[PDB]
Write an enzyme that holds these catalytic residues in place. Structure first.
Site, short mmCIF file in Angstrom:
data_model
loop_
_atom_site.label_atom_id
_atom_site.label_comp_id
_atom_site.label_asym_id
_atom_site.label_seq_id
_atom_site.Cartn_x
_atom_site.Cartn_y
_atom_site.Cartn_z
CD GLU A 11 37.75 28.60 37.87
OE1 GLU A 11 38.71 27.69 38.01
OE2 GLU A 11 36.70 28.55 38.47
CG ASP A 20 39.62 20.55 40.45
OD1 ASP A 20 40.16 19.59 41.15
OD2 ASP A 20 38.46 20.62 40.29
#
Ligand code: CL
Ligand code: CL
EC number: 3.2.1.17
Length: 162
Positions: A11, A20
């Site tokens: 991440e 994202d």
């Protein structure tokens, strides 16, 4: 290697609000803020999460705290989930981390939906599960990450992260 180091690789840890892979406003280690197109809404959610007027920026410790909470919540979601718990209980420590990783990324409902793969993991049919896991939007959209998680389920080692 452990779940935190594993998710940190997958991440990252951004300190300013970012979008994202799906274009949603997020902060830190994949902490989704909102699915709304609005940056203001994002900033509002961020302030509410951290407890201060942040102005879209978090400190390292704040991001890490969000991270700790999210890992804790993923594990707890698994344990509370009737479909997930039994698989988790059946796995070894490395493969449990792989399951945690999927839940962290896609939510409990999402993973609970991989019915066939879960049954295969439960039966320890590694190669079969890996093939099944790959037939998914998840694999097609974030292939490199999905390959890392898949290999982890297939081998039971951390090789893909080393
Ligand atoms: Cl929160
Ligand atoms: Cl990817």
């Amino acid at each position: 290697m452990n779940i935190f180091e594993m998710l940190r690789i997958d991440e990252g840890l951004r300190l300013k609000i970012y979008k994202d892979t799906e274009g949603y406003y997020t902060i830190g280690a994949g902490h989704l803020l909102t699915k709304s197109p609005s940056l203001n809404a994002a900033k509002s959610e961020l302030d509410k999460a951290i407890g201060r007027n942040t102005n879209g920026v978090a400190t390292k410790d704040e991001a890490e705290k969000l991270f700790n909470q999210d890992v804790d919540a993923a594990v707890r979601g698994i344990l509370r989930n009737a479909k997930l718990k039994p698989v988790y209980d059946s796995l070894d420590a490395v493969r449990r981390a792989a399951l945690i990783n999927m839940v962290f990324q896609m939510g409990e409902t999402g993973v609970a939906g991989f019915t066939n793969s879960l049954r295969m993991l439960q039966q320890k049919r590694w190669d079969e599960a890996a093939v099944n896991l790959a037939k998914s939007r998840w694999y097609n959209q974030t292939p490199n990450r999905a390959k890392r998680v898949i290999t982890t389920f297939r081998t039971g080692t951390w090789d893909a992260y080393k």
